[PDB]
Write a protein that binds this ligand. Structure first.
Ligand SMILES: [Cu+2]
Length: 106
């Protein structure tokens, strides 16, 4: 789902989220980028109820992209216990994204 809240409300949500959070930072204007886009939507549907998936256009919320030092898109960031724990950048294979998700489920 699209990230639609203020940077302050996003930071607050991240603090309070009781299940893992996965954020696609996108722009995207790239053929590799739209494949990561689609893969992330697929995983959101697959792990519906187990993780929260957001997508953020980095030019409509550069303060959010800025807090996480997102310099290039696509970037996938993982959140647990209120902060960003890991990032996969670029043409990330689907199985590697899946495996990151599965490590944060534990
Ligand atoms: Cu408020």
């Amino acid at each position: 789902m699209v990230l639609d809240v203020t940077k302050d409300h996003w930071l607050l949500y991240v603090l309070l989220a009781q299940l893992p959070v996965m954020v696609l930072f996108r722009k995207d204007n790239d053929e590799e980028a739209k494949k990561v886009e689609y893969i992330v939507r697929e995983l959101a549907q697959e792990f519906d109820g187990l993780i929260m998936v957001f997508e953020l256009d980095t030019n409509k919320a550069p303060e959010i992209a800025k807090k996480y030092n997102i310099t290039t898109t696509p970037t996938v960031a993982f959140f647990k216990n209120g902060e960003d724990k890991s990032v996969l950048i670029g043409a990330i294979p689907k199985d590697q994204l899946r495996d990151e998700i599965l490590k944060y489920l534990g």
